[PDB]
Design a binder for this molecule. Structure first.
Ligand SMILES: Cc1ncc(COP(=O)(O)O)c(CN[C@@H](C)C(=O)O)c1O
Lengths: 223, 212
């Protein structure tokens, strides 16, 4: 299974330096080019550049938008790809994708087919604060589909992990995209389980803040 | 810089309805390439080398064009096809990506499922107090919310948050949050969440009664 994994993402002070990583597996690295792409929250994709393969000298191409500031490289020892980011601006805040580019063969049916999940990068001095998680409990059990919620307030930066019953509750989950307010984010998590699961089976909301390293489970109390 | 324009920016089609899209460029390219992006995921190759369908791509899908004007067609719309599509070129460095088109699918209208929840203990015990309210699974998106407290609605401190078409039901949801001082909330008793949709001539609402 051709696997690509980007790490490095986190928050970064403006004008500072950020190094983006990306592990690889299931293919012969040195044989394949590797672009770098990014997407800013709610927008279009932006090609940043690739790096050729062994037979093409590992020569780096970039995007004028980012030329002189960003250098792409790779450790050929353990098949990883990098992205050096300098003089970072808020407008570099995004999520960054390593993609397997063209290769030493003709599988161009491939080439730009395998992407990673992308890593999110937020350019700002702005302070890091974990969230406060609270259970959205209704009031006056009715409705065959009773809906409960999770209020994840006061954290920074993004993202945060939210799933239900240690990921057991995938169905009927509604996590919203954060809203930035006062240099602060907030979102909710709604789930619609029947009375049978709750409040009987017990429903948990496991929240996480990778940045502020804040992992917490809010026992959704019946009330 | 071969800059690529896609039109339209947005569009909602009905199933079986015909669809054409374009990564249109300031300069000639040799090939148009296309991707499809569906919420929370990385793009997937869709059409390559202008016309060669990608892995797991339906034959209702075709790609074409020439020089400065290229196209992506959906012969007859299908619910699975909805996503954001990005054209573009690997002709001249630097490779550039199209402006995107955000293709949503047309389905049966559905009244939003409104819910309201009072300030939990913990937050309120934390010194805070704010009242959440989901407006789950509706169509179409276009929906306005309006809080109310003791009769007066609520402009200030109201931050809303939509999603895009769910993959599993093709609908939309919204999440207005009314935040207020711990001390303040106790100056009112009935907070009501009001929903405005084409599914209801009247503004469907929900609400509780503050109590101690
Ligand atoms: C993924 C991809 N990588 C690399 C290149 C060019 O590599 P070199 O500069 O190192 O030779 C192309 C040219 N794309 C052509 C086939 C086109 O987009 O029409 C390409 O699509």
């Amino acid at each position: 299974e051709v696997k690509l994994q980007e790490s490095g993402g986190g928050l970064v002070q403006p004008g500072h330096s950020l190094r983006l990583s990306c592990a690889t597996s299931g293919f012969t690295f040195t044989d394949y080019y590797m672009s770098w792409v990014r997407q800013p929250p709610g927008k279009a994709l932006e090609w940043l550049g690739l790096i050729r393969n062994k037979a093409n000298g590992y020569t780096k191409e970039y995007s004028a938008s980012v030329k002189g500031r960003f250098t792409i490289s790779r450790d050929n020892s353990q098949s990883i790809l990098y992205l050096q980011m300098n003089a970072l601006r808020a407008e570099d805040s995004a999520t960054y994708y390593c993609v397997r580019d063209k290769g030493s063969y003709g599988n161009y049916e491939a080439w730009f087919a395998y992407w990673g999940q992308g890593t999110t990068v937020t350019v700002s001095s702005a302070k890091t604060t974990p969230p406060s998680v609270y259970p959205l409990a209704p009031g006056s059990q009715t409705n065959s589909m009773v809906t409960l919620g999770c209020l994840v307030k006061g954290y920074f930066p993004e993202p945060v992990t939210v799933t239900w019953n240690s990921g057991s509750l995938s169905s009927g989950v509604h996590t919203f995209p954060a809203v930035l307010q006062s240099d602060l984010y907030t979102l909710s998590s709604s789930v619609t389980v029947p009375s049978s699961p709750r409040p009987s089976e017990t429903v948990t909301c496991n929240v996480a803040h990778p940045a502020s390293s804040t992992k917490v489970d809010k026992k959704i109390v019946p009330r | 810089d071969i800059e690529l324009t896609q039109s339209p920016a947005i569009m909602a089609a009905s199933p079986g309805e015909k669809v054409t899209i374009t990564c249109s460029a300031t300069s000639g390219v040799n090939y148009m390439h296309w991707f499809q992006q569906k919420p929370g995921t990385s793009p997937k190759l869709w059409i390559y080398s202008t016309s060669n369908l990608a892995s797991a791509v339906p034959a209702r899908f075709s790609g074409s064009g020439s020089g400065t004007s290229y196209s992506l067609t959906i012969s007859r719309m299908e619910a699975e096809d909805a996503a954001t599509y990005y054209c573009q070129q690997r002709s001249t460095y630097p490779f550039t990506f199209g402006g995107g088109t955000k293709l949503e699918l047309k389905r049966a209208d559905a009244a939003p499922t409104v819910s309201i929840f009072p300030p939990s203990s913990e937050q309120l015990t934390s010194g805070g107090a704010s009242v959440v309210c989901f407006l789950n699974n509706f169509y179409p998106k276009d929906i306005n919310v309006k809080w109310k407290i003791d009769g007066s609605e609520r402009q200030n401190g109201v931050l809303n948050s939509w999603t895009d078409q769910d993959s599993k039901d093709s609908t939309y949801s919204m999440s207005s949050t009314l935040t207020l001082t711990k001390d303040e909330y106790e100056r009112h008793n009935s907070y009501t969440c009001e929903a405005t949709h084409k599914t209801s001539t009247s503004p469907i609402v929900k609400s509780f009664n503050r109590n101690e």
